[PDB]
Design an enzyme around this catalytic site. Structure first.
Site, short mmCIF file in Angstrom:
data_model
loop_
_atom_site.label_atom_id
_atom_site.label_comp_id
_atom_site.label_asym_id
_atom_site.label_seq_id
_atom_site.Cartn_x
_atom_site.Cartn_y
_atom_site.Cartn_z
N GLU D 20 -11.66 -11.84 -8.87
CA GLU D 20 -11.23 -10.66 -9.58
C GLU D 20 -10.19 -11.06 -10.62
OE1 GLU D 20 -9.67 -7.74 -6.94
OE2 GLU D 20 -10.22 -6.04 -8.21
N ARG D 62 -0.55 -12.34 -5.25
CA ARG D 62 0.27 -13.22 -4.43
C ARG D 62 -0.12 -14.68 -4.63
NH1 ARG D 62 -0.83 -10.21 0.95
NH2 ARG D 62 -2.36 -9.28 -0.50
N1 LIG Z 1 6.06 -6.80 -6.93
C1 LIG Z 1 6.02 -6.56 -5.59
N2 LIG Z 1 7.07 -6.03 -4.94
C2 LIG Z 1 7.04 -5.79 -3.61
N3 LIG Z 1 5.97 -6.05 -2.84
C3 LIG Z 1 4.84 -6.58 -3.37
C4 LIG Z 1 4.80 -6.87 -4.81
N4 LIG Z 1 3.58 -7.39 -5.07
C5 LIG Z 1 2.89 -7.42 -3.89
N5 LIG Z 1 3.64 -6.95 -2.88
C6 LIG Z 1 3.20 -6.83 -1.47
O1 LIG Z 1 1.85 -7.29 -1.37
C7 LIG Z 1 0.97 -6.24 -0.96
C8 LIG Z 1 -0.29 -6.20 -1.82
O2 LIG Z 1 0.05 -6.48 -3.18
P1 LIG Z 1 -1.03 -6.30 -4.37
O3 LIG Z 1 -0.41 -5.42 -5.44
O4 LIG Z 1 -2.37 -5.95 -3.78
O5 LIG Z 1 -1.09 -7.81 -4.92
P2 LIG Z 1 -2.20 -8.88 -4.44
O6 LIG Z 1 -3.09 -9.03 -5.65
O7 LIG Z 1 -1.41 -10.12 -4.10
O8 LIG Z 1 -2.90 -8.26 -3.26
C9 LIG Z 1 1.76 -4.94 -1.05
O9 LIG Z 1 1.53 -4.11 0.09
C10 LIG Z 1 3.21 -5.35 -1.11
O10 LIG Z 1 3.82 -5.16 0.17
MG LIG Z 2 -4.42 -6.18 -3.20
#
Ligand SMILES: Nc1ncnc2c1ncn2[C@@H]1O[C@H](COP(=O)(O)OP(=O)(O)O)[C@@H](O)[C@H]1O
Ligand SMILES: [Mg+2]
Ligand SMILES: Nc1ncnc2c1ncn2[C@@H]1O[C@H](COP(=O)(O)OP(=O)(O)O)[C@@H](O)[C@H]1O
Ligand SMILES: Nc1ncnc2c1ncn2[C@@H]1O[C@H](COP(=O)(O)OP(=O)(O)O)[C@@H](O)[C@H]1O
Ligand SMILES: Nc1ncnc2c1ncn2[C@@H]1O[C@H](COP(=O)(O)OP(=O)(O)O)[C@@H](O)[C@H]1O
Ligand SMILES: [Mg+2]
Ligand SMILES: [Mg+2]
Ligand SMILES: [Mg+2]
Ligand SMILES: [Mg+2]
Ligand SMILES: [Mg+2]
Ligand SMILES: [Mg+2]
Ligand SMILES: [Mg+2]
Ligand SMILES: [Mg+2]
Ligand SMILES: [Mg+2]
Lengths: 254, 254, 254, 254
Positions: D20, D62
């Protein structure tokens, strides 16, 4: 509801394939009843398959009965892929030690070892499991499957149980478990000119049409004139159609 | 399956209560068909209620037809409380501005205010909702309910939609929403000698028996001799019974 | 959603009722844990009761830990009826055939007949089900429930079993099945100053707030006020709230 | 359960693929957040791929945050096929009637006929559904998907909508519906070195491990070894693991 009309068709008998072995006593009973009534109570359920053909998914015995009675076309209901799923029946023998077909001299390579791959057939009693693994068979796996099933099917008071069910075996039950087949595997069987054993494949079919009561006199001519009569018949029957969504107990007699 | 026999009974006509208003055109059609066929296609579905009595939950028109034709007993299927639930039908009027019963001079206290309590009746169009609250009614709430329903029921091309359904209204639809009743509320209605409007209560019933085809000649005598004949009839019919679990389209004609 | 914020409240200890007896071994470890941490990790889940009180539906041991620790105020989450359901835990006694407290019950009127009405308690072994029907009880339904449970809970190894479990009892197993209570019935127990036997009621609660970590110091000196601090605390925590919908394995440490 | 422990692993960054495209605004905030905390709160969820590689099914941002931060090793949780399903997000354009990138698409062959075969893409307004059937496509199915999504994603306000949502479109809404991909199809995209449009695929994953909080220092200097530290770390965290089954609102702070 107004789509069912479109799915109820008269299909030439030579365009229809079976994938499942018939049961001879069931065929005799179905044929006698159709001959006496000169109507087909429920249309044969079919799916479109390769080469412009149709494959029966419910109604092997009705199909063969109509063919033997001289029908050149078969009243079918065409079932779409989104409206059925395919599972399996397990076979419960309620007293395995009195089932001669199971207490016979055994020749297949049953084993109690659990392996990384899925077993082809599983035979269970209350305490133990024995497996047949496809990787151990010499004969066509289909011929082994049929030998296992027919060894007890007509003689040992078999009870079919949905493969997804919760069942607890008493001290003399035997349970035969078979793997569900996918539609592509069933089509490969048909392409080979073969059939799977009777009473093992379990099609779950939504929206079946029941009690259509097609008079056999509409089915004897491969050509037309009968098509106008078919449309008139169908129009009248559809007028009285009703839909039921929960479980039903249907009295199938007049 | 072997329990259905026990639920199919001949009940004295004077022991059966209705809770729902009949539809006169539906009654005429049902009565004509029963008279022509001299059979009852499907047994009346009943639940045990107070005082050793039985309440129809499906088959008002069949019941009234059998009574008028001189039957002293009614073929019923006794439904257990665990095998039904009670919902409601919403009524969709597909062009509300052409529905005279809805464009009439209005007299009830419709309001657009949302309150803490649940509305008795809700009338919806694409953009707005109007409510009738039980706390604002002078007439018996039952008489108001019937006036609202009958204002459009026979005349405005009503389409019944399950109260749980997802529906989007176009620019001229009207949707009438009614509250589901509990079994105790329905029994209080019957105890008062009243009926709810037709086509609003929605019983969801598992395991209905269909196509029993009870000959009316078994139903004309309140006394016996017919009971042995009833048992013989039932034994024969049950022999041909089959169970269907998914949605079915039943052709209801011979 | 801000609706959650409003359900997180500090409730006077004197306004909170339990419906379930506690286990002192679990109470000591819960108290010990809260004492070490000086925070309440997960708020007590309660429902609003009559008289303006609250009933714990999850957090019997957390509540009494805080209470025993001198907290004048309890951090709760108020659960609405729409977001929970009440089921039951079955009780498996894997050596029940040798459980003395169970095999000598000569006084209670167990029976094997299956009736149309749901039974009060069910006792199962490998081949027999015994039933206690509420209509046969000699004494208070609650005290009978209690006596049954305690006859084996204190002298025989027990493990809870979920309703969904497909469990085949072996030769020495016993399985106790209890009928799920409705919310009205549990409110009755509490208002008679009583409790239900431990480890039976099963609350399925959607939308629990987890990891709030309320400092204990907020829960004392209520006589001087605490609303200001509470909202200051909640606004900071609420901003990092995230919703998860499937089964999760939460690591509860830092 | 100890099965979870075995699915928590440190995987070389070079063995992990994305399916993605990312959003740089979300990447900066995720990177910023991880950098401040120096811990990865929730492990990256991956599935085992061909050639011995892994594919991220949750954790695109992440992963690249850690990767951009120089991590040679990624803390992942390995998800088995049985514990997830692949759905789709719909895309609502609330002012779509004025979305230029959408109303000038003269080249793509949209059509309104409903066929027996599921469509590739569906575009809905208040009164019309248009369909793209895979059998009519002029170019690669993926690049068409991409073009459609990007025609409005960068120049029109969009919000995702779940399949379960009952949504009635107003006069200026447009709703885009995409067919869910199977796992085999997503593996194909990744092996062609590509990605699917962002915000469409919806993975429903059961049993996610939350709040592991892996220190970043464990993820560098892999060339010196890290298995010893990793297991030391996991054993301490695993002991405080607790399973929750319904929807939860997790406070993600300390
Ligand atoms: N900028 C951020 N601040 C706080 N928590 C985050 C952040 N980015 C990701 N997280 C944590 O990771 C989880 C999923 O993030 P997401 O937006 O789906 O990014 P990814 O693409 O890594 O899945 C969230 O539930 C949150 O707890
Ligand atoms: Mg996600
Ligand atoms: N159900 C069972 O499954 C079998 C399937 O055969 P049946 O439905 O009677 O004929 P057909 O092969 O025409 O469907 C029957 O013997 C019936 O008892
Ligand atoms: N289904 C609809 O609901 C109505 C219910 O009446 P019907 O089932 O025919 O008679 P009964 O009152 O005997 O059940 C019918 O008019 C039918 O069109
Ligand atoms: N002794 C303890 N140690 C760690 N956590 C605990 C302890 N007691 C309770 N908890 C936390 O509270 C939650 C529920 O505890 P439970 O045993 O149901 O007690 P309660 O009766 O308060 O619900 C657990 O998920 C756990 O995270
Ligand atoms: Mg059949
Ligand atoms: Mg047996
Ligand atoms: Mg043999
Ligand atoms: Mg009816
Ligand atoms: Mg309209
Ligand atoms: Mg009017
Ligand atoms: Mg608890
Ligand atoms: Mg045991
Ligand atoms: Mg809009």
């Amino acid at each position: 509801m107004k789509q069912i009309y479109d799915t109820l068709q008269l299909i030439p008998v030579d365009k229809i394939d079976l994938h499942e072995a018939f049961e001879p006593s069931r065929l005799e009973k179905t044929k006698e009843s159709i001959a006496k009534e000169q109507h087909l109570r429920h249309p044969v359920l079919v799916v479109k398959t390769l080469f412009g053909r149709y494959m029966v998914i419910d109604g092997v015995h009705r199909f063969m009965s109509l063919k033997a009675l001289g029908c050149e076309v078969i009243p079918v209901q065409v079932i779409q892929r989104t409206q059925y799923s395919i599972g399996s029946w397990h076979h419960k023998i309620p007293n395995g030690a009195w089932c001669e077909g199971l207490t016979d001299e055994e020749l297949l390579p049953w084993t109690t070892e659990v392996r990384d791959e899925t077993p082809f057939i599983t035979m269970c009693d209350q305490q133990t499991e024995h497996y047949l693994y496809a990787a151990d068979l010499t004969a066509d796996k289909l011929d082994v499957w049929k030998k296992v099933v027919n060894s007890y099917s007509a003689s040992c008071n078999v009870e079919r149980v949905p493969h997804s069910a919760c069942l607890c075996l008493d001290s003399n039950d035997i349970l035969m478990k078979y793997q569900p087949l996918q539609i592509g595997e069933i089509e490969a069987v048909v392409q080979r000119g073969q059939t799977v054993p009777a009473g093992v494949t379990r099609f779950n079919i939504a929206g079946r049409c029941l009690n259509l009561q097609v008079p056999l006199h509409l089915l004897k001519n491969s050509n037309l004139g009968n098509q106008e009569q078919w449309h008139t018949f169908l129009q009248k029957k559809i007028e009285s159609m009703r839909c039921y969504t929960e479980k039903i107990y249907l009295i199938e007699a007049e």
